[PDB]
């Protein structure tokens, strides 16, 4: 709260997590200050205003299986006393066209996804940064998977 009291959050993926996307804050150069909460793996917004929302995920694979592999990343918000969730940001990638044949090397591949934008948020919104294939997640290095918001006006 040494900054100018602006609500801010920058959480990273737990490296100790085993094939599952769990957001954490107690890290080097990861923050969570000025009212922003983290409940049920979601970011809780404290004030009405214009927020910058961003997130990056990194997927990794060795070869391609017989089933089609789609990688999605989506940031959504749930309003206060709200059943449905409206999607704010979303991106799709398709790293695997065909199955790796038998007798061919399972060559590695990498796929990042970045999302960012400015949205008006109300007090009590619950923001989520979700993926569809947690088993493909890659948090081998520090600054590869993250999820952050910061109020620009309030």
């Amino acid at each position, epitope marked *: 709260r040494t900054p100018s009291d602006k609500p801010v959050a920058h959480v990273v993926a737990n490296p100790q997590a085993e094939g599952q996307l769990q957001w954490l804050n107690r890290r080097a150069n990861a923050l969570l200050a000025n009212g922003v909460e983290l409940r049920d793996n979601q970011l809780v917004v404290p004030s009405e205003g214009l927020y910058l929302i961003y997130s990056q995920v990194l997927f990794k694979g*060795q070869g391609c299986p017989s089933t089609h592999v789609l990688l999605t990343h989506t940031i959504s918000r749930i309003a206060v006393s709200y059943q449905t969730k409206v999607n704010l940001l979303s991106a799709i990638k398709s790293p695997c066209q065909r199955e790796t044949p038998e007798g061919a090397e399972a060559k590695p591949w990498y796929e990042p996804i970045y999302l960012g934008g400015v949205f008006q948020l109300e007090k009590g919104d619950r923001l989520s940064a979700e993926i569809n294939r947690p088993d*493909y997640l890659d948090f081998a290095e520090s600054g590869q998977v993250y999820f952050g918001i910061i109020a620009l006006t309030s």
Partner: antibody, heavy 126, light 108 residues
Framework: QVQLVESGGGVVQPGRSLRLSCAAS????????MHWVRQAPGNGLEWVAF????????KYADSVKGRFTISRDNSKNTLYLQMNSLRAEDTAVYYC???????????????????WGQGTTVTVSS | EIVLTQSPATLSLSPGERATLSCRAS??????LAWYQQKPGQAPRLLIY???NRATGIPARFSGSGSGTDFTLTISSLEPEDFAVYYC??????????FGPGTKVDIK
């Protein structure tokens, strides 16, 4: 025609070293990952080591970490297990097996170990 | 981190009966699970891969099912050759490629 043939086992004393071999034939060995899996007398199966097609990824079980070293020769189509600092608990029959090496995030591996060698017996008497 | 349980330890049945083997994981492995058969004096043999897919050359009486933490291997009709030891293998990384305790299948 598709086969793995192992060798190198025998009776060894604790603290010594032994190197097991697994010669492949009938398939493109340079494209498959390889596993070492052992079975103690009267016990079940225990996974030992793993390496990818070019050796970029190596994995070891905690009980052998720091003592065993898996390696491979793609011109000879052979897999090797170097066993240093042998213990009585290493007494087992050792199998090698091939794997497609297709994985997600380097953590979850599809398919399975479909062809195996005949095994080679390692006894660590004293 | 993950512990595999296999029930029952010993299964004694007659030829023609249906065998139901259970493999449980302390934490979810999605469907990255395999089933191997080992007859006395032979190397293991891949039966099931990715929980439900039948390996090449495996008779149709073997079937796999389950997801997450619970997995099941069913042999609809025992043959005199099916009497062996059956192991499940979780194929995650923590710890990597762990085999279960095994289930022993005998006659009578």
């Amino acid at each position: 025609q598709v086969q793995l043939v192992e060798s190198g086992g025998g009776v060894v004393q604790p603290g010594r070293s032994l190197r097991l071999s697994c010669a492949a034939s009938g398939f493109i060995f340079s494209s498959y990952a390889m596993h070492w899996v052992r079975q103690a007398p009267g016990n079940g199966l225990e996974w030992v080591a793993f390496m990818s097609y070019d050796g970029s990824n190596k994995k070891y079980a905690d009980s052998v970490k720091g003592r065993f070293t898996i390696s491979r020769d793609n011109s000879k189509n052979t897999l090797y297990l170097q066993m240093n600092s042998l213990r009585a608990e290493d007494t087992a029959v050792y199998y090698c097996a091939r794997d497609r090496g297709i994985a997600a995030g380097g953590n979850y591996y599809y398919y399975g170990m479909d062809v195996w060698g005949q095994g080679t017996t390692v006894t660590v008497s004293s | 981190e993950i512990v595999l349980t296999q029930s029952p330890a010993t299964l004694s049945l007659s030829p023609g009966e249906r065998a139901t083997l259970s493999c449980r994981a302390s934490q979810s492995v999605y469907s990255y699970l395999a089933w191997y058969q080992q007859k006395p004096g032979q190397a293991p043999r891949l039966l099931i891969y990715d929980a439900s897919n039948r390996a090449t050359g495996i008779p149709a009486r073997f079937s796999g099912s389950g997801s997450g933490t619970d997995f099941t291997l069913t042999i609809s009709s025992l043959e005199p050759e099916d009497f062996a030891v059956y192991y499940c293998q979780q194929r995650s990384n923590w710890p990597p490629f762990t085999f279960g305790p095994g289930t022993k299948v005998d006659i009578k």
